[PDB]
Amino acid sequence: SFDALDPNLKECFLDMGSFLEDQKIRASVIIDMWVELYGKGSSILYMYLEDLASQNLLKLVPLGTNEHEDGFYNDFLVTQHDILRELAICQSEFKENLERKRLNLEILENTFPDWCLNTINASLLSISTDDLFSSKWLEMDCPNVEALVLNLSSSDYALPSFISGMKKLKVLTITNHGFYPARLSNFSCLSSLPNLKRIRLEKVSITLLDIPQLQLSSLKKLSLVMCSFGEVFYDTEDIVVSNALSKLQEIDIDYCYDLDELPYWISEIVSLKTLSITNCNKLSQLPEAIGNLSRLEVLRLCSSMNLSELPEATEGLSNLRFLDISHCLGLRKLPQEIGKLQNLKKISMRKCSGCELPESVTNLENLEVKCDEETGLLWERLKPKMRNLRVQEEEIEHNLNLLQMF
Amino acid sequence: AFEALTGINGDLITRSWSASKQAYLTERYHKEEAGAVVIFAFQPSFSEKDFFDPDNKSSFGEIKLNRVQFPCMRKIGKGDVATVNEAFLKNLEAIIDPRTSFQASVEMAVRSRKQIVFTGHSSGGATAILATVWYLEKYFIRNPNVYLEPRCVTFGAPLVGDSIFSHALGREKWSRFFVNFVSRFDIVPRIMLARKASVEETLPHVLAQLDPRKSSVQESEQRITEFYTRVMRDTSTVANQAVCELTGSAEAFLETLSSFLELSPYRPAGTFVFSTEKRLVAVNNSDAILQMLFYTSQASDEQEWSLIPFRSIRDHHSYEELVQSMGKKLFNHLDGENSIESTLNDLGVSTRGRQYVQAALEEEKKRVENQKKIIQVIEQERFLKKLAWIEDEYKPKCQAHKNGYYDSFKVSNEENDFKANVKRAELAGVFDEVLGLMKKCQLPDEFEGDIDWIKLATRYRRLVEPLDIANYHRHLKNEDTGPYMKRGRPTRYIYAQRGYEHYILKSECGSCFWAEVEELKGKPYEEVEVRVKTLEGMLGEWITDGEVDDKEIFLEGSTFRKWWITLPKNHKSHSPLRDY
Amino acid sequence: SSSSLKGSALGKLVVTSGLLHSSWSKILEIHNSGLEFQIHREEKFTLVVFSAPPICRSSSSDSTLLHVKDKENPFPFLCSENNPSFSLHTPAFNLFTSASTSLTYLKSELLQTLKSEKPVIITGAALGGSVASLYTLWLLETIEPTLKRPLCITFGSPLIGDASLQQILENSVRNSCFLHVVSAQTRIKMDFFKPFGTFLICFDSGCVCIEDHVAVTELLNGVDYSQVLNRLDQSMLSLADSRLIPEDVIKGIEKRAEMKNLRFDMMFKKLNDMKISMAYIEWYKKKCKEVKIGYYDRFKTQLAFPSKEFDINIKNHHKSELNRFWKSVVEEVERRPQSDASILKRRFLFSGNNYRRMIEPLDIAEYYLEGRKEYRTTGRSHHYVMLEKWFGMESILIEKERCKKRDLSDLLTFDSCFWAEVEDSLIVINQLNTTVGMRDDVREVLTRKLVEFEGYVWEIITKREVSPEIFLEESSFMKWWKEYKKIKGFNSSYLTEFMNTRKYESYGK
C-alpha cells in the first residue's frame, strides 16, 4: 500500500502524519505546505490529492458548489481514518528523534521531553499542547526545520523564542482547538527569519495591525480563518507598508465574523494580485482606497450577505481579470463605471438574481458569466449588444456536506 | 379551399338548405336520403315559449346539463358541467323519445355506412346542434371512425351554449363538425345576448315578423327600432366585458362594477361563416366571433341608422340567394390570413373593433406559445433525471432494506431521504406552475386531452403521491388540518386522476392507498369492518393496473403488513390476500 | 396594447351600465351654504346623497395632521407602522366631523343594508364629493372580500389627502371603492395634495378609465357636469374615434403593470425555495437534538460565541431569507387579498403557520441575548401576530382529531412564545436572588409571577401541546427548573411531583 505507491505519493502521504487525529483539514492547508516544500504547482498537487483519494487513502469532500479555480481550495475537506494516519506514522520512527526528518512532538502540562536539550534535525516539526499549558518555553535548537505546525487548546499562548533559531523556516500554521479564541502574543520574533513565505492562522485572537509593524520582508501570502480582530485601530502611519511588505501578493480572509471595517494598511500593498473576503457577514462596505491597488487581478467576495454595494474606485482597478460575487445576497447594483475595465473576462454571480446590471456592461467583450437561471433574465436582454458573450448555467445540487462542520 | 377547411362542398349546402326548407311543413323533423347520404332537418318555431321557457326563473333561460346523458360536456379536472338553453333542450328531448321513431331511423342509417347530416333554419338550427352532440355522445365516441363522422349545417341559428360548452367541444376535437351561416345584419344570431326583461314586451311582435310561413303580418317602425336598440345595447355590454377581462387587466374596479351588472352567459361554438355580397369569411375563434357579432352590424355611416333595424329582419330571409350563389364569392379564412384590415373593413368593422378582434387572435397565439414552453420544459433531461432517480435508485435501495420507500422516507435517517425530499419539492413546484396556467385559461382547449401529458402526469402521480402522504403523516400535519383526503390533498393530483380516468373510461384512487391505511389503523375492528373490507376488495384491481406495486406493500418492515397481521384470525382466515 | 384597450372599454362599460345618470339626477334633485343629505332606499340599491357649501378659494391648501395615538382621529384603522400618520383637507374634515352625529345611525343602517347583500352608493358634487369620500372611508374600517363594500361616485371634486395617504391606499382594496368623474379641462395643484382611487376622464368625443395615479398626475396637473354627461351620451354612437391620451402615458402604464404582474408571480415561484430552506433547518434541528442541547440553546450559544461553520450559514443565509420572504408575504396580502373567500388561500397559510412555529423561537433568542424584556407585549413583529390570527380564524372551521397514544417527537409547540415566558421567569428569579433592601409588596408580586408561570407550564404539559425537546439536559427550561427548585424549598405541587419522580422522561412516547 504505502510501498505500492509511487515515490512522490510516498512523501505526500507521509506529510499526513503531522496532523492531529480525526482533524477535519481544509485542502488549502496541506496544498500551501506542499507548494513551498516541493516547489510544484497547486493544480498538480490537487491532482495528487485526488489521486490519493482514488486509492482510498484519504477522504475528499466538497463543501459547496465552488469549482477548482486557481488555487481556491479553502472549500474541500480532507478527512482520514485513524489507522491510515497511524500507518503514515509507522514509516517514520525508524531513525532517531534528534535526527528524524518528520518528527511529531507532544507536550503535556509543561512536561517537556528531556531529549530536546539536544540538536534536532527534523525538517517538518509539529507541536501539540493541552488546556493547562502555561507557555513556560524550554530553549531548544532546531536548525533543520522548514515547516512548522502548532496545535493549541489554551486560553492564552506565546510563541516560542527559539523560533528565531530556525533560519530555514518556510511555512507556518497555527490552529486553535479550544472553545474560545486564543490570545497570541510574542509574535515579533518572526522578523528575524529571512525565508518565511506563507503564514496561516485559524481561530486566534489577533490585533490585525501588527503585520506592518513586524517587517515581513519576504512574506508571499497570508491567510486568516475564523479570526477575531478586537478593537479595530488604524492610527499607525509610522511604517511604510510598501517597503516592509515588498513581496506580499495574496490575502485570504475567510469567516471573520467581527470584522466590520477593513483595515487601512492593506490598501498600501501595491504588490497585491489576489484579494479574497468570503463569508464575512459584518462587512457592509469597502474603503474607497481600494482603487489604489493598481495591479489587482482577482477579487472574490463570495457569500458575504451584508455587502450592499461595491466602491466606486473599482474603476481604477485596471488589471482585474476575475470577479466573483457568488451568493452575495445584499448586493443591489454594480458600480456605474464597471464597463471601463478593459480586461475583465469572467464573473460568477450565482444567486445574484437581485442585482441590477448598469448600462456600461455592454462595453465589455468576450466575457463568460456563470449564474443561475433567474440571474440570466438580467443577462438575456443585453445579449445582442455583446459580440462574444457566453452565459453558462449550472444548477445547485443539494447535499448535507456542511453538516460535518457542526 | 372552403372544402379543405370545413369538410363539406357546395351540393351539401344546397341539399341542406332545401331540406331545412321542406321541414317547415312536416312535424318536428324531416328525413331525406340520397345514395350514401341521409340528412335530418328540424322544424323551427316563432313563438316566445320556444326561446325563453315560461317555467324557468332565471334571466336568460339557461339550465345545466346532466352528467349521465352528456358525460363529456364538462371541465374534466375542475368538475363543472355545461349550460344550455332550456327551450331547445326540451325540444330535443321531445324529439328523441321512443314515441317519435327517430332513434330507429338514425340506427338504420348508421348500420348502412352512410354520412349523417343535421340541419335547420333559425330555431331548427339550434336543435340541429344539440342533436349533433347527442349523436357524438352515443355513437362516435364509442368507436371513432370516418364512417361515423357527422355534419351539422345551420342557417342563422341563435346561440346555444356557454363557455364550458365551447371548451368541451374544443377539448374533444369535435368543433370541426359544426358550421353556422350568419348574414351580416341578421338579427337572430344576436337575440340571446340580451336580458329577458329587456325584450319581454316587444319580443312576440318582431318574432311574428320573422316567420316566413305567416307572412301576412305588417311592420311597425318603432317596435322594430326598440327591439333592435335594446338587443344591441346588451350585446355592447357583453362584448366590452369580454375585452376588459381578456388577460385579467386590473380586475379590481371591474369586480366592483360586476356587483352592478347582469350579462348573458352564451358564447359561439363551432365555425362561423359571415357573408356579404362580395366575400365569405370563416372564423374558428370564439372571442373574435363574439366581437364581430357586435361590430359587423354597427352602422357603416350615420344615415344608415334608420335602415339597419329593418334590414336585419329582411336579411334573416336571405339564405337562399346565399346558397345558390356562393361559388361566385371570394373565400378567406380569417384566423390564418394576416391582411385582415381589408377583410374586416369590407365587413364594415371600424378601427377600434378591428383592434379588439386582433387582440382576441393574439391571445390565442399566446396560449399556443405557452404550450410550447411547457413541452420544452418537460422534455428536458434534468426533469427526467429527477423522475428517474426515484424509480431506479431510491426505490430499489429501500426495497433491499426490507421495509419500502414509504417507511424509509417516513423514518428519514439518511441523506438519501433529504435528497428525496428536495426532489419531491422541486417536482411539486413544476406541476403546480402548470396547474396555475390551466386555471387561468392560459393554455389551449386541447391540453387536458393531450396523451403525452396524460402519460407524464400519471407516472408522476403514481411515483410521488405516496411521498406526499408520508410527508403529511411523518410530521403530524394531520392533527393540524385534519385527514389528508379532505383538506390535505393537493389539486395537481386530483387533476391528474380525473384526466386519466376520463381518458380510459371513454379508497377511490389507488395512489391514495396509503392515506386510507393511515386513517384506518389504531382503531377497534368493529368500527372499521366496512372500510377495511372495501380496501382489501379493491387491492387486487389496484395491484394489476399498476397503481400499487406488489414488491413494496407486502414487505416485512412495512406499515400495512404490521397492521394487517394484528387483525383477528377470524378475519385473517377469509381475507382475499391471506396468502401474502 | 392591453392597457389602452382596457381603459377605453371599461370607461365604455361604466357609461353603459348607468350609474352616472341616476346619481347625477339625484344630485340635481337635491340642488335644483351648509351640509345636508338625502337617502333613497330604492329597489335596485340604497343611495346616499351629500350636498355641501361652495368652494373656498383662500382655504384651498390647508390641512390637518393626524396620528395613531391621537384620540380625535376618526380613522385609526388605516394608519400603520410604515405610515403612522396622515393629513387631510381641512374644510371637508370639519364638515364630516360636525355631521358625525346622526350619520352614526346612518352607519348602522348602511352596514346592515350591505350585510344583506344589497349595493350602497355614496355620492356628491364638488365639495359634497369630498365629504362623501370621508363617509365612505369611514365605513371601510372592516374589510374581507367575502362581504360587500360601498361604492363612492364623485363629480368634479378637489383632492383631500397627501402622499402619505395615497401611499396608505396605493394598491389596496380600499382604492377599488372610489370613482372620480373629472373633465380633461380641469387642472389640479398636486404639490401637496394627491390623488387616490380610480378616475374616469370625460373628453369631448369619449371617456377613459385610469387606475394609475402617476397618469392622473401627468394628465391633470396645473365646469357644468350635465353638459359633459350629455356629451358622453351623444358620443356613445360616434362614427369615428381617436386616442384621447398620448402614447407616452400608455407606455408608462403598460410598463408599471407588467412589473406588477411579474412581482405577483415571483412569490408563488419562491415559496418552493423557502421550503428547501426549511428542510435544511429540519436537519439542523435533528443534529441539535442528537447532541442533547436543543436547537434554541445551540443557536443562542453560537450567537454569543460563533465557532462553527454550519451555524453561521443557518443564521445568515437560511433564517435571514425566510424572515425576509414572510415579512414580504404578510405586507403584500393584507392590502390585496387572495381568492376572495380568504386571504392567504391554503399553501401560504399552512406553510406560514409551520414557519412561525419553527422560526420565532430564534427571534426570541436574539431578542433576549441582546438585553431586552417583555417580548410578548412589546417585542414581537407584526407578521408573526398576523400569521397567528389568520390561522386561528380558520382552525375552528376544520375537523381534526388528536390521538392520545402517539409519538410527539416531531411536534412543534403551538405557543410560539414559550421561550419568551421562560426568559422572563429566569429574569425574575435572578432579580429575587440578587436584590437587597427590597420591599415586601414587590416580593409578593414577584412570587405571584412565579406561581403564574408554574400554572402555565403545567397546563401546556398536561394538554400535550409542547415538544419533548424542552427536557434535553442542556436546555434553558432545565436551568429554570434547577434554580426554581433552589428558591422554592419543599413546597410540593403537581409540577414538582412530575419533575422529581422523573416522569418527564416518558412524555410523548
Swiss-Prot record, chain A:
Keywords, comma-separated and alphabetical: ATP-binding, Coiled coil, Leucine-rich repeat, Nucleotide-binding, Plant defense, Repeat
Residues of the full protein shown: 404 to 809 of 809
GO biological process, one term: defense response
Name this protein carries in UniProt: Probable disease resistance protein At5g66900
Organism of provenance: Arabidopsis thaliana (Mouse-ear cress)
Gene Ontology CC: cytosol; endomembrane system
Keyword Disulfide bond part of the UniProt annotation: no
Domain of life: Eukaryota
LRR repeats: 247-269, 271-293, 295-317, 319-341
From Swiss-Prot, chain B:
Induction: Up-regulated by salicylic acid or upon turnip crinkle virus or avirulent bacterial pathogen infection.
Keywords: Acetylation, Coiled coil, Cytoplasm, Endoplasmic reticulum, Hydrolase, Microsome, Nucleus, Plant defense
Modified residues (N-acetylalanine): A1
Keyword Coiled coil: yes
Annotated compartments: Nucleus; Cytoplasm; Microsome
PANTHER family membership: PROTEIN EDS1-RELATED
Subunit structure: Homodimer. Interacts with RPS4, RPS6, SNC1, SRFR1, AvrRps4 and HopA1. Part of a nuclear complex made of EDS1, PAD4 and SAG101, that can be redirected to the cytoplasm in the presence of an extranuclear form of EDS1. Interacts (via N-terminus) with PAD4 (via N-terminus). Interacts (via N-terminus) with SAG101. EDS1-SAG101 and EDS1-PAD4 form separate complexes in pathogen-unchallenged cells. Part of a nuclear protein complex made of VICTR, PAD4 and EDS1. Interacts with VICTR.
Protein name: Protein EDS1
UniProt gene name: EDS1
Swiss-Prot record, chain C:
Documented effect of changing Y280A: Loss of interaction with EDS1
Keywords, comma-separated and alphabetical: Cytoplasm, Hydrolase, Lipid degradation, Lipid metabolism, Membrane, Nucleus, Plant defense, Signal, Transmembrane, Transmembrane helix
EC numbers, comma separated: 3.1.1.1
InterPro entries noted in UniProt: AB_hydrolase_fold (IPR029058), EDS1_EP (IPR041266), Fungal_lipase-type (IPR002921), SAG101-like (IPR044603)
Induction: Specifically induced during senescence via a complex epigenetic processe involving histone methylation.
S-adenosyl-L-methionine recorded as keyword: no
Subunit text: Part of a nuclear complex made of EDS1, PAD4 and SAG101, that can be redirected to the cytoplasm in the presence of an extranuclear form of EDS1. Interacts directly with EDS1.
Name of the protein: Senescence-associated carboxylesterase 101
Native species: Arabidopsis thaliana
